[PDB]
Amino acid sequence: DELYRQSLEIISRYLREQATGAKDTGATSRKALETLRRVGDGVQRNHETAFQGMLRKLDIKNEDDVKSLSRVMIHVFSDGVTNWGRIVTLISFGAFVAKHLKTINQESCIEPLAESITDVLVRTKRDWLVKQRGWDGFVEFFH
């Protein structure tokens, strides 16, 4: 799936940049990162309170914590209205969790976190993402 692999590249790179501050390792994939850096950073500033609250409540300190959350996150994310704000909040929350993982570690484990965020996104929103012209539709929505 091109939608799954494209989503994994964009979500993994943003979470890696956010956790470190660089970061260290098809124009739409590139233009989606620049939009996500701009809108994603804004969501992390405007909703830090709710992000700190969810993070404290979920705890999330290891890969086993990352795995069990995804199984709950798939179910609750498939419920209710879908829009780009909701999708960027999911990714923004992923970046917020990743910054916390680097804070209590040395780096990892943010790669299984990015896979779990992508799996939540593509498994629950694939039809809507298709109807919205995928990651290209994302760039236009926040031009």
Ligand SMILES: O=C(O)c1cc(SCCc2ccccc2)ccc1NS(=O)(=O)N1CCN(c2ccccc2)CC1
């Ligand atoms: O999004 C934020 O970060 C958020 C922050 C505050 S804190 C008071 C802010 C305020 C503003 C102006 C003047 C006085 C107080 C209050 C609401 C905020 N969001 S939500 O958009 O209204 N929202 C989303 C987060 N919600 C949540 C639900 C369950 C578990 C944890 C969080 C609560 C509902």
Ligand SMILES: O=C(O)c1cc(SCCc2ccccc2)ccc1NS(=O)(=O)N1CCN(c2ccccc2)CC1
């Ligand atoms: O998009 C929604 O459907 C959405 C709904 C709520 S209501 C859950 C409040 C809560 C309470 C305790 C601990 C964590 C979260 C809050 C945030 C929402 N989105 S998100 O910010 O994009 N996000 C992150 C939190 N997610 C989560 C839900 C249940 C267990 C574990 C994680 C849902 C996806």
